[PDB]
Symmetry: C3
Subunit: 218 residues, 3 copies
């Protein structure tokens, strides 16, 4: 495909202006494209271009593009692979300020993400960066961001409990209606609220587990 040929042109890497032209329309092709498999191949190729080559302006522009794809995307599987791409670029970086900018980008991605499971995966990639990072001050900056991500999952767990106590209260009031009249219609109504309580409880335990994972990564 044209995307496959455009990836072959990036292998040459003759000039920075050439690469900038490629990564431009590679981002435009990734935008407004439904196939996530295609976007994932574009994401891995763009990350390889940023991992290789030189110039921070090229790497920053690739990082900005990858972040933009994650902001627009509603697929957590694609945003995760983008986060993994940003983590791999930071691991193979010779400038502390470059990884500082990438980590702060991943921090902003987690603030926007509604899924607490995604904040846990961002915290895992940030923990993997810190393991191989060496050099303190940089690692201490990672731990500061990791503690910010744990604060995100904590607030998300608080909202999930409040939603769980509210549905629980509706369940106690719907059970209050059942005591007065033991009709069939009141039973299936309590059954619906019980299912809604189970679903809200499962969601709360998923966000609870994502918080515990972020705690272990610290």
């Amino acid at each position: 495909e044209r995307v496959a040929e455009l990836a072959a042109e990036a292998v040459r890497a003759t000039d920075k202006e050439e690469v900038i032209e490629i990564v431009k329309e590679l981002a435009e092709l990734a935008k407004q494209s439904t196939d996530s498999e295609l976007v994932n191949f574009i994401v891995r190729a763009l990350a390889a271009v940023a991992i290789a080559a030189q110039d921070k302006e090229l790497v920053i522009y690739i990082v900005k593009i990858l972040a933009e794809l994650a902001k627009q995307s509603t697929d957590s599987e694609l945003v995760n692979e983008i986060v993994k791409a940003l983590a791999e670029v930071a691991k193979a970086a010779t400038d502390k300020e470059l990884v500082k900018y990438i980590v702060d980008i991943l921090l902003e991605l987690a603030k926007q993400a509604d899924d607490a499971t995604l904040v846990a995966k961002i915290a895992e990639q940030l923990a993997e960066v810190r393991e191989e990072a060496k050099d303190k001050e940089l690692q201490e900056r990672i731990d500061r961001v990791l503690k910010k991500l744990i604060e995100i999952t904590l607030r998300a767990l608080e909202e999930s409990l409040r939603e769980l106590r509210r549905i629980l209260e509706e369940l106690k009031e719907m059970l209050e209606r059942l005591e007065k009249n033991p009709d069939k219609d009141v039973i299936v109504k309590v059954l619906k609220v019980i299912v809604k309580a189970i679903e809200a409880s499962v969601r709360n335990q998923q966000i609870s587990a994502a918080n515990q994972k972020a705690l272990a990564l610290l």
Copy 2:
């Protein structure tokens, strides 16, 4: 009101004997008073008296009074505001031994508190003290108390699980009764136990989340 006029007399702070007379009947007015809003204004005013002025005997007596109000109180919202008052007095303290006594008081408040959510809020105020405390040995004493509070929430989470497994067993035995006879009365009985299981599960997840918060504060 007389409480408002008594707070104005404390603004003068001419003599320690004057202040002791004020904080005495301010504590007596707070005791046997139903309005928590009034007690909260008394608590904030007493904390401002302890934050200002001098002499540890005055501050210790104010701390003892605030602790006594929290022991008697059954309102977690009021006990929390009292804990926040004890934390603010400790943050603006020039004697390490004074904050050591205040922290050990907050530790004793958490041991008495039945609510694991309150132990988490006490751990948050203790964590806020340690952040601005500086000077090691003091911070290491805070972390020792913080680990004691985590042990409190762990034991509370164990009791909640045992209560959850017991209700679960009643649910499995009540479901065992339903298989024999699928009557209406046996259905609404299982429905009652399911609601009791949901309620016990929600309580267990609240105490679980309070434990995770105490873990993050460490």
Copy 3:
């Protein structure tokens, strides 16, 4: 009994060859024995023999035997007491390499154990060893194993959530069957799945709590 007389022969401890003969058939008596109370007395006596006496070959053989009993045993209460026996031998050890071998054995016991609650108890005994161990490098090895045990409970919590989301989906599809026909038979079928969802939720909260305990032990 012969086991009680064999324990009396170990009190003498005249020769290493004598003790090796005793601990041999003490292990053979413990194997293929249904009474756990008897095995527990054999386990405590063998641990006292390893805690006392000398020679690592004797202690290693006793440790191997205790580990073998835990691998075969399906009783978590017995495996726990065996883990406590391995922890007590390591606490009263004058060779760092001996406790390193015992800790790595306890690590292998936790990998085999299906119960996440048992991995939490192994982590508690490993935490107790580190508290009294002194000498860094050894403690850092304990923390590395403790972080491995937390990874075990995390993966166990992930499997429990996936099992919980699957049963939840069956619950949502069984509730989908109830909307079409509000028969009695479809109600008791949803009631069965609700009970299975409650049971799976309780199991997930037990493994969740075991993970939080391992986090606090770190």
